[PDB]
Write a protein that binds this ligand. Structure first.
Ligand SMILES: [Ca+2]
Ligand SMILES: [Ca+2]
Ligand SMILES: [Ca+2]
Ligand SMILES: [Ca+2]
Ligand SMILES: [Ca+2]
Ligand SMILES: [Ca+2]
Length: 295
DNA sequence: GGGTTTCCACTTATTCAGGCTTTTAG
DNA sequence: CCTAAAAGCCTGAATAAGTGGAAACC
């Protein structure tokens, strides 16, 4: 069905994609190892249409269930990876994942000249995999006795355009309706909230949202060793003037588009001050009940 | 072929999204 | 007061990332 704008695709890939390089013990293989290179996205079943739309925009990849509640798009067929490369050359990633893309690209070169069927090339793929995502397993590191660096250039890039932002937000965004309980008259204060969430590794990008969108603040959380950030907009005039117009003009994808639409409906109610009456408050309540985790 | 590529079922780790309450601003 | 905006928690699952196994094939 619908194809996806390329910058929206890149922004959603910055959010939900991952590159992959398997180096597998294989006794039937000449060098003792077989490889598989590619790029993949795993989403909840409700958003399978996105994967099919990506599959039809690029015309590559295979779709399969990933457990009971999720579905994946996986591109590993070697020739079709040239499409992945051409897309991300023209429409490049901006998060730390760009670093993983560059490794994917180096690994493609190795395999494009058949060097991975030789000892030298497998050894290079191991050095590449060492810096890719979570790196080498203990067994792989010990099977390749040499000083292999795990570090890589930090990525620091700016948001290229609102299309990238809409793809990224379709992955990490949250259009929330906070029903703030109060012993007040009607009691609950309706508060529209926009939020983007990201691991602290892209702090610089998150901070730039405040500059880029003209609003919001950055909150920091952590759970044990794991830290992340939330960009959060609460002032309704910023939501109604600076946030809703961006996504009206750069359309979201997936079920989160429906969530943003309902969110706008509540924004209208709030604008009309109708959120201060039992009728508007009850309409808001049913709208919130039927969106996000109630969808 | 016979190594090698590709695909499909499935799993494990954590970074997200999200629903919630309390406090302050104006 | 009254309402809007900010501060803030923190859980658990939709992600990210990865593996086992075998068919397909060049
Ligand atoms: Ca992400
Ligand atoms: Ca294919
Ligand atoms: Ca191929
Ligand atoms: Ca998402
Ligand atoms: Ca973990
Ligand atoms: Ca805070």
């Amino acid at each position: 069905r619908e194809s996806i704008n390329p910058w929206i695709l890149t922004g959603f890939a910055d959010a939900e994609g991952s590159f992959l390089l398997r180096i597998r013990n294989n006794n039937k293989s000449s060098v003792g190892y077989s490889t598989e290179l590619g790029f993949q996205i795993t989403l909840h079943n409700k958003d399978k249409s996105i994967l099919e739309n990506i599959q039809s925009t690029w015309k590559v990849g295979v779709i399969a269930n990933s457990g009971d509640n999720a579905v994946s798009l996986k591109v590993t067929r070697f020739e079709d990876l040239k499409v992945i490369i051409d897309h991300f050359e023209k429409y490049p990633l901006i998060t730390q994942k760009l670093g993983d893309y560059k490794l994917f690209k180096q690994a493609f070169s190795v395999m494009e000249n058949k060097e991975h069927l030789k000892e030298n090339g497998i050894k290079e793929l191991v050095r590449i995999k060492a810096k890719l995502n979570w790196g080498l397993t203990d067994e792989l590191k010990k099977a390749f006795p040499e000083n292999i660096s795990k570090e890589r250039s930090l990525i620091n890039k700016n948001i290229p355009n609102f299309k990238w932002l809409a793809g990224f937000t379709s992955g990490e965004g949250n259009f929330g309706v906070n029903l703030i309980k109060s012993k007040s008259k009607l009691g609950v204060q309706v508060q529209l909230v926009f939020r983007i969430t990201q691991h602290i590794k892209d702090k610089n990008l998150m901070n730039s949202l405040i500059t880029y969108l003209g609003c919001g603040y950055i909150r920091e959380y952590n759970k044990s060793e794991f830290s992340w950030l939330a960009f959060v907009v609460t002032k309704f005039s910023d939501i109604n003037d600076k946030i809703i117009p961006v996504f009206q003009e750069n359309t979201l994808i997936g079920v989160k588009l429906e969530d943003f639409e309902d969110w706008c409906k509540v924004a209208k109610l709030i604008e009309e001050k109708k959120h201060l009456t039992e009728s508007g408050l009850d309409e808001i309540k049913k709208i919130k009940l039927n969106m996000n985790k109630g969808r």
